[PDB]
Amino acid sequence: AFFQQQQLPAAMADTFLEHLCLLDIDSEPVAARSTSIIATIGPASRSVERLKEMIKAGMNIARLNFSHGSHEYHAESIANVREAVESFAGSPLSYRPVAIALDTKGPGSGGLSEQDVRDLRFGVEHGVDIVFASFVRKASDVAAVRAALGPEGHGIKIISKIENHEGVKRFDEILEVSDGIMVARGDLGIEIPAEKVFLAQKMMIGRCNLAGKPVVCATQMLESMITKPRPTRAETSDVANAVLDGADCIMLSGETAKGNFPVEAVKMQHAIAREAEAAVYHRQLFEELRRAAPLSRDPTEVTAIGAVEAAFKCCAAAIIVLTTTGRSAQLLSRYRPRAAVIAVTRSAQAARQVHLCRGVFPLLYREPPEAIWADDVDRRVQFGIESGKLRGFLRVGDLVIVVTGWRPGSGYTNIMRVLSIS
Amino acid sequence: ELGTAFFQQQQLPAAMADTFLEHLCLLDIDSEPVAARSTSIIATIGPASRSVERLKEMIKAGMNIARLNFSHGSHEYHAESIANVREAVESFAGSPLSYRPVAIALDTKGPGPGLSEQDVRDLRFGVEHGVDIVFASFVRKASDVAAVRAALGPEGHGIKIISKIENHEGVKRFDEILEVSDGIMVARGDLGIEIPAEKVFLAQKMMIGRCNLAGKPVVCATQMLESMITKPRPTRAETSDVANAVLDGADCIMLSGETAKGNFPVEAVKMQHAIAREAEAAVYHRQLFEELRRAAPLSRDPTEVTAIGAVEAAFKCCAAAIIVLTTTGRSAQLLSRYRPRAAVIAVTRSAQAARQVHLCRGVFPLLYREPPEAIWADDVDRRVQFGIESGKLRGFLRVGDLVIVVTGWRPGSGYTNIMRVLSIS
Amino acid sequence: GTAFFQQQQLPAAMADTFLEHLCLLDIDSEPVAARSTSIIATIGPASRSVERLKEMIKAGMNIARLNFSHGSHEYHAESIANVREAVESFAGSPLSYRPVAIALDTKGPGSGPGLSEQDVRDLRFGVEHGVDIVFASFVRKASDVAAVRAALGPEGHGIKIISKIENHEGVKRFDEILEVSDGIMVARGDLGIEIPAEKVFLAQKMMIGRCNLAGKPVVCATQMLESMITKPRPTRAETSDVANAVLDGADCIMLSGETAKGNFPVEAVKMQHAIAREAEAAVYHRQLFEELRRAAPLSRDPTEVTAIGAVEAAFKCCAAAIIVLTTTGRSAQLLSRYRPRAAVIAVTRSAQAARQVHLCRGVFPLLYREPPEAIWADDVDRRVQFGIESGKLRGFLRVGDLVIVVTGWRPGSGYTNIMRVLSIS
Amino acid sequence: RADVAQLTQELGTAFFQQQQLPAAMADTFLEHLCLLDIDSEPVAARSTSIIATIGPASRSVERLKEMIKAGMNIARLNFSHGSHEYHAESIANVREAVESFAGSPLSYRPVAIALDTKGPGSGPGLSEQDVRDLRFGVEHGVDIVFASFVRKASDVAAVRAALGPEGHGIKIISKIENHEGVKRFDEILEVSDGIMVARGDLGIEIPAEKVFLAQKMMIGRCNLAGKPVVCATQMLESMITKPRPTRAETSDVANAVLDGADCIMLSGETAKGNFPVEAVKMQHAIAREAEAAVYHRQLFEELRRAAPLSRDPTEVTAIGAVEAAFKCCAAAIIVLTTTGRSAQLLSRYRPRAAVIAVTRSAQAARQVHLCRGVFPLLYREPPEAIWADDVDRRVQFGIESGKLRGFLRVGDLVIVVTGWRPGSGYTNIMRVLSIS
Numbered sequence A: 001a002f003f004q005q006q007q008l009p010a011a012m013a014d015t016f017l018e019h020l021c022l023l024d025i026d027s028e029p030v031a032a033r034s035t036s037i038i039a040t041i042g043p044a045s046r047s048v049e050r051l052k053e054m055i056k057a058g059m060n061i062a063r064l065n066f067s068h069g070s071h072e073y074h075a076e077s078i079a080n081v082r083e084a085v086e087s088f089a090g091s092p093l094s095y096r097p098v099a100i101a102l103d104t105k106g107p108g109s110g111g112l113s114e115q116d117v118r119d120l121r122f123g124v125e126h127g128v129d130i131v132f133a134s135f136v137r138k139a140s141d142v143a144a145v146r147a148a149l150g151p152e153g154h155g156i157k158i159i160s161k162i163e164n165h166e167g168v169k170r171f172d173e174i175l176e177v178s179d180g181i182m183v184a185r186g187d188l189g190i191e192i193p194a195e196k197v198f199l200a201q202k203m204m205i206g207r208c209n210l211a212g213k214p215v216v217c218a219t220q221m222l223e224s225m226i227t228k229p230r231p232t233r234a235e236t237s238d239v240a241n242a243v244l245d246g247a248d249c250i251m252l253s254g255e256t257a258k259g260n261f262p263v264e265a266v267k268m269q270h271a272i273a274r275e276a277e278a279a280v281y282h283r284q285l286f287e288e289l290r291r292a293a294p295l296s297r298d299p300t301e302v303t304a305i306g307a308v309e310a311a312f313k314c315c316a317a318a319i320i321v322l323t324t325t326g327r328s329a330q331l332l333s334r335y336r337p338r339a340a341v342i343a344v345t346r347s348a349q350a351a352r353q354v355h356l357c358r359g360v361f362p363l364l365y366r367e368p369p370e371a372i373w374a375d376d377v378d379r380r381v382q383f384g385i386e387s388g389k390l391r392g393f394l395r396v397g398d399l400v401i402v403v404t405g406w407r408p409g410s411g412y413t414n415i416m417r418v419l420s421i422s
Numbered sequence B: 001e002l003g004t005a006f007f008q009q010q011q012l013p014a015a016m017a018d019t020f021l022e023h024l025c026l027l028d029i030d031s032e033p034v035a036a037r038s039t040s041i042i043a044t045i046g047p048a049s050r051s052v053e054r055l056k057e058m059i060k061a062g063m064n065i066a067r068l069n070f071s072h073g074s075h076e077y078h079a080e081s082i083a084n085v086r087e088a089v090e091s092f093a094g095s096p097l098s099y100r101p102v103a104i105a106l107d108t109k110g111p112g113p114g115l116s117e118q119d120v121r122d123l124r125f126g127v128e129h130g131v132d133i134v135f136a137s138f139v140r141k142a143s144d145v146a147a148v149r150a151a152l153g154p155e156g157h158g159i160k161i162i163s164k165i166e167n168h169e170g171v172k173r174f175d176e177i178l179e180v181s182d183g184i185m186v187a188r189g190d191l192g193i194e195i196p197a198e199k200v201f202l203a204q205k206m207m208i209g210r211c212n213l214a215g216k217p218v219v220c221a222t223q224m225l226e227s228m229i230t231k232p233r234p235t236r237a238e239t240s241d242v243a244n245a246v247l248d249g250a251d252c253i254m255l256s257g258e259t260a261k262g263n264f265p266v267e268a269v270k271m272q273h274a275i276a277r278e279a280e281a282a283v284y285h286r287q288l289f290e291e292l293r294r295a296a297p298l299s300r301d302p303t304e305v306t307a308i309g310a311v312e313a314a315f316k317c318c319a320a321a322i323i324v325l326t327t328t329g330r331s332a333q334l335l336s337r338y339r340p341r342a343a344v345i346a347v348t349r350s351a352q353a354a355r356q357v358h359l360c361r362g363v364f365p366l367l368y369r370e371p372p373e374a375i376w377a378d379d380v381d382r383r384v385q386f387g388i389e390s391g392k393l394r395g396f397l398r399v400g401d402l403v404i405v406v407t408g409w410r411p412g413s414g415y416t417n418i419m420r421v422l423s424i425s
Numbered sequence C: 001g002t003a004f005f006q007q008q009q010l011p012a013a014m015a016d017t018f019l020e021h022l023c024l025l026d027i028d029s030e031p032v033a034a035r036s037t038s039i040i041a042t043i044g045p046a047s048r049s050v051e052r053l054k055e056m057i058k059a060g061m062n063i064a065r066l067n068f069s070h071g072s073h074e075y076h077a078e079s080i081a082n083v084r085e086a087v088e089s090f091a092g093s094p095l096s097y098r099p100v101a102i103a104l105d106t107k108g109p110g111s112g113p114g115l116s117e118q119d120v121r122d123l124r125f126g127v128e129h130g131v132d133i134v135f136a137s138f139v140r141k142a143s144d145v146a147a148v149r150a151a152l153g154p155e156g157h158g159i160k161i162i163s164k165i166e167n168h169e170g171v172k173r174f175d176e177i178l179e180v181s182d183g184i185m186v187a188r189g190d191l192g193i194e195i196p197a198e199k200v201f202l203a204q205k206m207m208i209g210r211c212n213l214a215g216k217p218v219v220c221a222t223q224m225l226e227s228m229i230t231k232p233r234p235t236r237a238e239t240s241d242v243a244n245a246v247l248d249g250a251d252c253i254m255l256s257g258e259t260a261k262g263n264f265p266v267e268a269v270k271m272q273h274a275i276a277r278e279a280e281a282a283v284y285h286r287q288l289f290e291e292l293r294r295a296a297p298l299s300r301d302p303t304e305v306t307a308i309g310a311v312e313a314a315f316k317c318c319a320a321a322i323i324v325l326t327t328t329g330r331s332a333q334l335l336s337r338y339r340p341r342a343a344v345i346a347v348t349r350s351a352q353a354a355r356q357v358h359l360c361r362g363v364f365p366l367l368y369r370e371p372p373e374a375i376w377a378d379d380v381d382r383r384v385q386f387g388i389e390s391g392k393l394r395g396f397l398r399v400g401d402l403v404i405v406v407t408g409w410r411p412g413s414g415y416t417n418i419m420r421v422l423s424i425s
Numbered sequence D: 001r002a003d004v005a006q007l008t009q010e011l012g013t014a015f016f017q018q019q020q021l022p023a024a025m026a027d028t029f030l031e032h033l034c035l036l037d038i039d040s041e042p043v044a045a046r047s048t049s050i051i052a053t054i055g056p057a058s059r060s061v062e063r064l065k066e067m068i069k070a071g072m073n074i075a076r077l078n079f080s081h082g083s084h085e086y087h088a089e090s091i092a093n094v095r096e097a098v099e100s101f102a103g104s105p106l107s108y109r110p111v112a113i114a115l116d117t118k119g120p121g122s123g124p125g126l127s128e129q130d131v132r133d134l135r136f137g138v139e140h141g142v143d144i145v146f147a148s149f150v151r152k153a154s155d156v157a158a159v160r161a162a163l164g165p166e167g168h169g170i171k172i173i174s175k176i177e178n179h180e181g182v183k184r185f186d187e188i189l190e191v192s193d194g195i196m197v198a199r200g201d202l203g204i205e206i207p208a209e210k211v212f213l214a215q216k217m218m219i220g221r222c223n224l225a226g227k228p229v230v231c232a233t234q235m236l237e238s239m240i241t242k243p244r245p246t247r248a249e250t251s252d253v254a255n256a257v258l259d260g261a262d263c264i265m266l267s268g269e270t271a272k273g274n275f276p277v278e279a280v281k282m283q284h285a286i287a288r289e290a291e292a293a294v295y296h297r298q299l300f301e302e303l304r305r306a307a308p309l310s311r312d313p314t315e316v317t318a319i320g321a322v323e324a325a326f327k328c329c330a331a332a333i334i335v336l337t338t339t340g341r342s343a344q345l346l347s348r349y350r351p352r353a354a355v356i357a358v359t360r361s362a363q364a365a366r367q368v369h370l371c372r373g374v375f376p377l378l379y380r381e382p383p384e385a386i387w388a389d390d391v392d393r394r395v396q397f398g399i400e401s402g403k404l405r406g407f408l409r410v411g412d413l414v415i416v417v418t419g420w421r422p423g424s425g426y427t428n429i430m431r432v433l434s435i436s
């Protein structure tokens, strides 16, 4: 029965054609949903009670669209999100961190606009985790956003939105200096022929997967759900194909900001993503990712590949990684393991930001410290295991891969352990 | 010889890639499609697309198959639709550059345990009116297909039966249904209500893959450009859906309300045409052909053996087209199963076969009407040159191009065994 | 039948990985196909008698090597005459006659920089006596090949030049030598003294791989069955060496002292024949054909395009043979480069081409002696029938087998463009 | 190029020109062959073990010291010839020559002693002389038994029973020398520690032109099973009377290594020939060239795909360690082992990195020579009070001996494989360490 669930017959197939033929509608998904859901906050999703429902439905990142609304409006939104998130902090083994992202208005007719500088300053002051920089056309646009974030905003992640021909053509230079990319299909579909957008989406997702950087698929994913309780056949297909393409995050705009079914739209994206993740052809995917990733003398990079290889060999339920900045979890994520990457961190900001990486499940470690570093480490490992058992990721008898470092401080991951649960 | 510009068009850098990841990374929005659109467009005829003038516009936009939905309307209504389609098609019989045959398909109302009384009457209507295809609704088992086949009276055995899979039973009994059907339609509308909406993409991808493996046509249907019923442009999810159905391996893409009752029927056809052309150039032929080749079983049928040699030969020289002489369409279908990048120009004396080959991806029919030559070898040469002259006239061929010619050793269907490499003069 | 798929290592040939392939090798799986790797035997005192030469032709000798490092022109002319007498002693049965090529192995430059004066005299002797191949000793650069070609003059245009790589310079300048040569010989004797003995296997594997990539014949030579000069059976290392040269991709295997001066010249030929047959069945065609196909560049030459379609077609039906009509042998060489499991039966009227095609693996020459038919298509059919009749007589074909026939559209060399699937009657 | 561009800038273009690295990075096997370079020098230590047969030509303690320096890893005693007194003198001479280098335990070279049985002859099973010879082996502390003419699983059970309770640690390598042994191969391999492809008798029992098929099949199955396989007989036959081998002989040795043989053997070449040391030197030189020419890109992928899923932490750690070593071009994998099993599981994935096995067991240190790429280090120090410190001292001993023998340099990356608790069977940790 284990090998009949989560499309395992289709995952073992020798060819991609055999893989497609073996897809079974009766093979149920078992693993936790790996692709993060970004929901846009607006009138339909601003109440603390509504936001609690969206967190339970699966929202991982809350997007504030600075194209509409005042700073007072957005600060109220931020406060409501934080209130709804902290309403579940009572049970630290089941608490879900939610990132806050600021989507800039953009340059419009103009480089970096004066309103954008004021909005970016607002984001730093209000402690946002991510910036979705609108209409990025070159590497110098990213540098301008980075400069506007100042010294207090070094930790904020910059996700460049590609929305026009220039951004697509200069993609490589933008990706090099960005933390990730958003495939902003709305404007892109007006700037380039609508029938060419799928080529740009597939190219940008592929390059981001190659680079190991997060990529978000955005706009009109479940558009009809703004007024209707169920999406169209094209919409469910679109969500599924974005996940199959390799998107780290999927987004909802009007569907959650102004629609009549914001919670239902989140539930739909959650349901589709789970099905699509089980349908991933890991046999060729892991091989291609392995072959494409360059040789490395960075021990974190070397431990990540060894850990993902080890997890595939034993069908590990999870890979528990200790991370400070989230980097060790990101390097595990780039190899697209079938095993969940449970990232145990003390940094609340890192816990929110690792939602950008597919398959990373952040656990904010709030237990009291241990005096001996070795005991402190073991405690954070056992923490990941208890939360994993509570949340359904792990059972007694399961195998896990534990990824740690040799000394405290970020950048020293170099150990991989094969551990049996209880 | 061909130029650097030749190798930058139709996603050729992405097609030459050693891995699927490299292939995705090499996709270029500036790489323009050159080949003719190979995925057929099925448009549903209704109040929005019934007039002879409106139908002429849809043929020019790219409609290859006209679907008559027998869930709505009387026999008198559908016979008027058939007559209007035939009138609009024959309005271009003068100009060989604009004349294209259009298939007529009957979509049944559906069942009850088995074939309904109304369905038997509707199938009899189809035989009497000379329809080419039947889209049999709610097929759940092989005996359902046999019932449709039996209902296609003594005169309708040439009609193609495309079984619509619309429920859990049809998905579970897929293999037995495909074995006895001519092809499949992934009827996503009802399927999305019978099974969880989030599982439909799995059923679509599985059924397309199995149809590609079997060498049988598969249609992706319902809500492809749904918003275009009221809006002139589709959503980002809708264009993505059409593109992904083509990339998945669908032979045909369909329009229902978009053409039958919508405000932009011609614009919806134009949109599907535009997306399909882009998506066909983005197909990863390097791994696709290898997998199709490896998966297809060994064969001692000369048509099947010639088809693989012809597709292999066409890939080797970047052949502008594969010209195949076929009477039933079978030879063109066997070429099509290997998914060549070259156009399959099928020269036939059969008007029905010319209409039905629209079900197979990349098959471009040419109806030949010349009186037969006394020497068979001269009749073959005359039909082969007609394929080249038409090709030249339509933009597929130029002097200096290479084409692969597939013929047989003796007259009559079933003897295809020759593949020739010809230089266009 | 089940028994068919148990012979000639077919389970090992169908394996998904190279590791699975090795694990499936069966010592009880008997070779059925004809031995495709040619045997070159050096003529000397042990193999000069007309009766002895008839035994070597029956044992499997395809090419007779005349070593111009030893003996006078008078000696070599007597050799040539004895070979031709023994070969023509079987010309009474044209359906079973075996052509034998005559190759001249030059003495070399020695201390000189380029072509020696004795080499010029020996090369002109070869042209005067009608030799087919030249094994040019110690080739170090492309200009060495040009010098041999110039010394052959205008009358020696058809002679094939196989460059012997015997030193570090030849290995380093390999690419420029191969570009201008008809093929290569891996002269392991001198090479093993010029470079460290433990590095020779790397040079052999590299040169064979590059020759296979280029589609040019490659010969593995020297000490293959060395112990058989005095002993009736070879060592375990010697049989392994012969088998591995075939598995590496060598078109020809050679015997030097083993046939020229040894006590068991016929037994050495029989041993090489037996090992090569075993090794050819153990070839992993699944990956090999895929790699050859992928590595070969796109082509607008119809012969090149027909060859790949024909090999692809032969694999699809497990064709017993590919019968090709050839004037120069080039059409057979282009089929051979794709390493088909099917025998390439080359029917030719050129006695020289019939002798030279022995350089290409899996090409079985048939010299057709009949005068032309007035109708060219009838002449073409008669030759094809001759191939079928010879192949039936020799055991390559049986009634019911499928065969691929490769012909051209007009008389004369360079016009191959047709591939046909034929059932043996 | 981008998949090796950063590491190329770091390690240099000269690094990537050595040990057939361009040929090893090739996308196809055809490209791999085309890229083989005679100028690309081997850098890695010779990983295929050399088994030399001891006889009149190689019995003296002085001659044996020369053979150990030439590369001999296993000494074979052929019980088809000679008395027990003769073989005991041979064993004593081997041990004397081996211990003459024990002064420096950081550079000492352990040598296994293998007993090759006479065989059943006319009989159906284990002969009476074989029982006496096997008892002799147990009494004299031999490490391996090469059991002649094994034809079924019950033959290896008989050898195991004849070894008695004290010979439980001895490895049984079954010799396949006839059609029955080839046909029942799977049942024999299941119960054996490894196999020897005994080509001499096999070449007389089956057609000589079919032996290469049997060799290639048995090596492939042994590689798939993760068990040692020895290629034997007539490898450098001409070197019995001549100082240089033939072109077929060098080719044969190279092809046995390329086929996947863990060990290569010398029989008459060392036992009775005129050039026993030269034959060992030749096999050493060829094996080093052949190992660099291995197409690791497809090999590792195939080994990985063929090996079944495992819930054994040693098995899981071994594949993660080999994958990690390939990612950074690790100079070595240092593994702590008691029985040699952890080193054997690393070896089955055919890493290009040397597997430096640190052990306290002298028998395990001798027996790991059966596994390709395993370099045994016998640790003689007394245990530390804290187990974690004892472990670290052993790891450091491996790093220091690896630097001393040339395997490691400052700046190199190494993968360290250890367990979480003392005792055999608990390997579960993989560490990436930078050499300082």
Ligand SMILES: O=S(=O)(NCc1ccc(S(=O)(=O)c2cccc(O)c2)cc1)c1cc(O)c(O)cc1-c1ccc(O)c(O)c1
Pocket: A016, A017, A020, A206, A209, A244, A245, A246, A279, A280, A281, A282, A283, A284, A285, A288, B020, B021, B022, B024, B209, B212, B247, B248, B249, B283, B284, B285, B286, B287, B288, B289, B291, B292
């Ligand atoms: O290796 S993959 O898993 N599969 C990729 C693949 C997709 C198509 C084709 S084909 O040659 O067009 C084809 C062949 C046969 C039948 C056909 O109908 C089509 C081959 C291989 C993967 C790797 C990536 O680098 C990535 O970025 C995403 C994917 C990917 C793509 C689609 C999936 O369904 C999926 O699970 C993963």
Ligand SMILES: O=S(=O)(NCc1ccc(S(=O)(=O)c2cccc(O)c2)cc1)c1cc(O)c(O)cc1-c1ccc(O)c(O)c1
Pocket: C018, C019, C022, C209, C212, C247, C248, C249, C282, C283, C284, C285, C286, C287, C288, C291, D029, D030, D033, D220, D258, D259, D260, D294, D295, D296, D297, D298, D299, D300, D302, D303
């Ligand atoms: O595709 S091939 O058939 N073989 C290709 C191949 C050979 C080795 C390796 S491996 O990665 O080293 C390896 C993998 C697994 C187990 C192992 O023990 C070894 C993989 C694949 C072929 C192609 C040519 O370009 C050619 O010139 C000759 C051959 C060839 C070589 C050896 C044969 O046994 C054979 O039949 C053919």
Ligand SMILES: O=P(O)(O)OC[C@H]1O[C@](O)(COP(=O)(O)O)[C@@H](O)[C@@H]1O
Pocket: A322, A323, A324, A325, A326, A327, A328, A329, A403, A404, A405, A406, A407, A408, A409, A410, A411, A412, A413
């Ligand atoms: O992903 P990052 O930022 O490199 O953090 C991983 C770090 O986690 C650790 O295992 C634990 O260290 P801390 O005690 O600082 O939490 C480090 O040794 C390692 O460097």
Ligand SMILES: O=P(O)(O)OC[C@H]1O[C@](O)(COP(=O)(O)O)[C@@H](O)[C@@H]1O
Pocket: B303, B325, B326, B327, B328, B329, B330, B331, B332, B379, B406, B407, B408, B409, B410, B411, B412, B413, B414, B415, B416
């Ligand atoms: O695709 P189909 O129905 O098998 O038709 C292919 C047939 O067409 C031909 O090429 C031409 O034959 P006709 O003259 O009868 O049209 C035959 O030789 C071949 O058998």
Ligand SMILES: O=P(O)(O)OC[C@H]1O[C@](O)(COP(=O)(O)O)[C@@H](O)[C@@H]1O
Pocket: C303, C325, C326, C327, C328, C329, C330, C331, C332, C379, C406, C407, C408, C409, C410, C411, C412, C413, C414, C415, C416
């Ligand atoms: O292999 P080559 O030398 O190119 O010769 C192939 C030629 O042989 C033929 O099949 C038969 O021609 P001939 O009648 O001149 O022998 C030609 O059609 C073709 O051009």
Ligand SMILES: O=P(O)(O)OC[C@H]1O[C@](O)(COP(=O)(O)O)[C@@H](O)[C@@H]1O
Pocket: D314, D336, D337, D338, D339, D340, D341, D342, D343, D417, D418, D419, D420, D421, D422, D423, D424, D425, D426, D427
């Ligand atoms: O390879 P083996 O025989 O399983 O031994 C590996 C064992 O060696 C160790 O690394 C060290 O253990 P010891 O203290 O017994 O020498 C263990 O942690 C591990 O279980």
Ligand SMILES: O=C([O-])C(=O)[O-]
Pocket: A134, A161, A163, A183, A184, A185, A186, A187, A188, A218, A219
């Ligand atoms: O801004 C966006 O997200 C877009 O344009 O799609």
Ligand SMILES: O=C([O-])C(=O)[O-]
Pocket: B137, B164, B166, B186, B187, B188, B189, B190, B191, B221, B222
């Ligand atoms: O009938 C159809 O096409 C459907 O239900 O999707």
Ligand SMILES: O=C([O-])C(=O)[O-]
Pocket: C137, C164, C166, C187, C188, C189, C190, C191, C221, C222
């Ligand atoms: O000339 C040769 O053939 C040689 O030197 O081996």
Ligand SMILES: O=C([O-])C(=O)[O-]
Pocket: D148, D175, D177, D197, D198, D199, D200, D201, D202, D232, D233
């Ligand atoms: O016994 C042996 O070693 C043989 O037969 O080769």
Ligand SMILES: [K+]
Pocket: A065, A066, A067, A103, A104, A105, A106, A134
């Ligand atoms: K915005």
Ligand SMILES: [K+]
Pocket: B069, B070, B071, B107, B108, B109, B110, B137
């Ligand atoms: K209907």
Ligand SMILES: [K+]
Pocket: C067, C068, C069, C105, C106, C107, C108, C137
């Ligand atoms: K010579």
Ligand SMILES: [K+]
Pocket: D078, D079, D080, D116, D117, D118, D119, D148
């Ligand atoms: K013995």
Ligand SMILES: [Mg+2]
Pocket: A134, A163, A184, A186, A187
């Ligand atoms: Mg926008």
Ligand SMILES: [Mg+2]
Pocket: B137, B138, B166, B187, B189, B190
């Ligand atoms: Mg329906």
